[model samples]
Target chain A: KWTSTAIITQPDVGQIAGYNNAMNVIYGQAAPKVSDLQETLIGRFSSAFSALAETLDNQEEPEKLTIEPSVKPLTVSYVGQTAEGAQMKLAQYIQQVDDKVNQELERDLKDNIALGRKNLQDSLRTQEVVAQEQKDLRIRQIEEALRYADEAKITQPQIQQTQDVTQDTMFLLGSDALKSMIQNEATRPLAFSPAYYQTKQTLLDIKNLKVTADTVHVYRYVMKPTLPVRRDS
Target chain B: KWTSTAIITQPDVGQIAGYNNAMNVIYGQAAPKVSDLQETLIGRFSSAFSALAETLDNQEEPEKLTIEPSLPLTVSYVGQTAEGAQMKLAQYIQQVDDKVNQELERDLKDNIALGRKNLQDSLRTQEVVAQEQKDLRIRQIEEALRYADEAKITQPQIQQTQDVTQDTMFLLGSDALKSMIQNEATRPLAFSPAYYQTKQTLLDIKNLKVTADTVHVYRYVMKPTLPVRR
Candidate 1:
């Protein structure tokens, strides 16, 4: 469809903040700061830590215990944002499941891309850790002089483990003819295209996107994603 | 000749002393302390501090100047006389008399005076970095390393010397032997022979001894050697 304006069909507006990544695809200017978006994810995730959202009359500072959401265990939101950023670096033409020709193909594509993103993040983290370990070793001179007197043990590898995927594997999948693994037993692993969307309300608030004189076209306009994997939910 | 009383023919009472080693061969019961033996080695070795010694010395701790003796130098008095309490390294310690004997045989085999001079060359108190000096220093280190190999001493040791006119063993070493010897001499010397040797003679001799005798001196246990394969 030679659509007059782009529309992101799956603008994830879940209780979790994959929806934040939904907002992340816009221009850097006028976009919410990543830190602010991260806080929103935390607020959504933390009911125990933060009490119920208060009405205007009873608003108070919500208490919390655990923090550092970026490092939190299930931060698909974090990885999602990371993937969004990584998208800019990939030089190839719209590769990987670019065509959402049908809804069936679209769901399978998302499954692989989501799984693939976690693999990439883990590899990057592991590389960062080992690089720091060697750097730590470089600063320790003469520690080996009395090597017999001392036993040397280095920090062990600290990579986050993901199922059936390694950083290299994820990268290979991302690059390999764009055929990301599909969850459906029948469909060949399909690639997902870059999805960029702004809910009209969210775009209305955008300082620059304040100018979203949008349009519609020949392609059938699908409704927004009914189920966004939200942390709040 | 299997003589009755052992004799250290050339007891060098000179400044840097091994002459003390000679004095050391006296009747084990009445012999001077090992402290005196060290004094003797030190007194004779100080005269020739080759300049490089100062450069290296000033840069490092003066108290721990140069190290690297070419030998595991020690003297043990073993006999049936004094009740053995003070007797030292039996298998490894070379008493003054033992050295004196070795000195005589060595002198007869090689020229004592010539060899002594060479030993003196290696033992120069001050090590310099000039072309030849450096060459000899390296040889001394190598010699020190060889000496270390023969003894159980793991670290480098002090220098050594001799006054045996006919004591070729007095000159037993070379530029290496000399560098390992002489006065104002470095201490905590690289006891290479001590390090690499199978026997810990220096360790045995380090602290002073008790009753000076041999008949019943129960041998002390040696320090466990670290397997320095290299």
Candidate 2:
């Protein structure tokens, strides 16, 4: 609870819109005018859209598939006898073919746009799941470590008497160390200078008087030393 | 190459066939055989395909769009009024409608497949990134644990060494105390029992056995042989 916070912002309308518009331009608008349906649909439309999407994801672009002239051109079979009439029918057929092809291409674009948005939305949702899973995993790891630590008793392990004296002695001795280490004559003991009898008596009391009351009185008379604790590393 | 991978492997004929088979069970072959066009289309066909697709993406099962009787039905136009004289224009229009509707339905299948492929591709790319993020997070967690574990063992050693260091300095302070006692004496009795005891502690300090390495402090506690006189 000390700290909590995703860089995963909402996929903006602009983001989806940007993808849609880019697909239209890249696949639909920029596509070469071709009479071949399969060639145009797959080579240009699918390839271009895939290329652009890959670009968005920062991957290497797919190899561009181009239309080679070796692929036969589109031709309509006319049933009429007259050359003029046949040509007319042929023109009309070509027009109809173009319209159908263009309409299909346009639908592809719409589906592509819809698909792009779907991708964005799906990814955003998945990312959220991933984040939560990782967080849960991290929490479990920490908890497991804590459990292990508890089971292993990874904490201070010293007698109470030693613990108290070590704490007291650390303070009593620290000021002298600080002075010597710094070459400061002005430094004085930060704790009361216990008369030798007092320290000896403290040791005896700790050994003999395991109960409180009397032991408590001895500590009560001794000035409680305030030691400054700090992290050195 | 701008893009690349799959949570879903390439949906081969087998994959698509798998889907188609599942749909047949859920809708068509398993469906209540009804003599209705629009009913079967929307209820069985559309719902079944959509359901399969949604499941593929791990989404919640959509509110199953079922077939009901309130929605009407499709009927064919057949009027043989004059000897095999069905209305040509009307029949031709119906023919066009039939062809166009079939084509559109066919296109719907293509688009469904295409859309599913696209979704799979996009999800695969995003999954790669998710994996990277997960990997980075795990590394950080593990490193943090390592540091914590190291701190657990090392911190107490540091503290114990620090304790030893402090005691050494306190014992060394006896040298200073000796100076204080000799230079700042008031009367002979100030040097009475206290003076002899202080001298005894100083000898004890001098005789104390000790040795050390460059990196570690030898343990030395400040204990005097005799207590200062009261």
Candidate 3:
């Protein structure tokens, strides 16, 4: 007679969550501590940590807990006076059973550990990539702001202008110099030229404006006008 | 000045656990109810349920609610003029922020659902494959046992040998013809030479022990040999 048994148990979701949270906290804290390391060192540390966590998480249940022997005492005895070849064959059969079971159990353990490690590494890599992107974004923003500030300063030009005049001699008594001077100042344009006509007319109008009659008139023709003029230079 | 406000409240872990347990029980009891759906549908359902549960478990505290109006609401009415562009820009910014947040929330919900569906499908497939393997192993064991039993049936030749010797032999002094009786009784020797050697040896020993005064000549050998003749 032959019999086989199997048992399956659901994973504890809470336990898994707890493990995840604990690992996340550890990883989060370790990130800054290892930040100064070279990229290779960082990668090695991360991978080692992840593998350890996965192996711890994915360990199989103990043999005594998982398998229950059906036969009481589980004692097996063989008796028969047989050929040497038969005895050898029986021994080989028992050895084969033991070897196969051992190989299967070892293979399962190896595969589970590998799978767990892969999953942990993938998740960690994802988080690391996101963090690096965030850091790069902040750096780029700072560089751009500094560049704009540098471009805001440049040289600018300033300009200045001024004008002045003075009366030199008085006209004869009862002469029309004052009227002539007022009429000349008002009607006859000063410094009349194509380019200065508009400016001269405006200036002459301001000079001939009615005020007190005691006004000095300059009739003598001087070779040089005794006035200092200032202009934008 | 820059300011940020977050209206957060403590999460009820017990409530979260209760909600998760309820979901597990519902799915466990009526697994078929949700088993056949496509991943997208299942994902959406799971995400919606999770979001709802999260909202309930992490209800906002009333005291933590914040309202701030320090932001420059005057940009739209600056310099005795209505700055329609500035107002429009502000409104546009708000709309963009709202749209982005809404999309993110929606995607989070959808992805959570999808993940849940993926997990369920994976678990179901694992269970089915395990069961099939177990059945295959059981069948192999049965076949091996059948071969073992058939190997035992090949012992019928031993039984036939015993039958032939028991039927024909007679005791000494009986009036049976010696040639016909001896040939028929010893015919088993043709198929089993080992039996013939043992029987001949026993007869020789019996003759050597005969008394001198008494005439004790054996006419026939009647005692059957043990099956050890094999």
Q: In order, what lDDT does every prediction score?
A: 0.26, 0.29, 0.27
* TM-score preference between candidates 1 and 3, better one: 3
Task: lDDT winner between 1 and 3, please give it.
Answer: 3
| TM-score to true structure, per model | 0.14, 0.24, 0.19
Candidate 2 vs candidate 3, lDDT winner: 2
Models ranked on lDDT? 2, 3, 1
Query: Number of clashes in model 3?
Result: 2
- Candidate 2 at residue B43, lDDT? 29
Residue A180 of model 2 has an lDDT of 32
Instruction: Score candidate 2 by TM-score against the native.
Output: 0.24
lDDT by residue for model 3 (A123-164), tens = 334434433443343333333322222232111111122222
lDDT of 2 by residue, B1-230 (tens): 11100011111333233333322322223222222222322322222222222222222322111111222312112222321122432333233334333433443344334333333433344344334434433333333223323223222222332232211322322334334334433412212353344344434333322111101101112111121221
Off by over 4 Å in 1: A1-109, A142-233, B1-230
Q: Please name the candidate that would achieve the greatest TM-score relative to the true structure.
A: 2
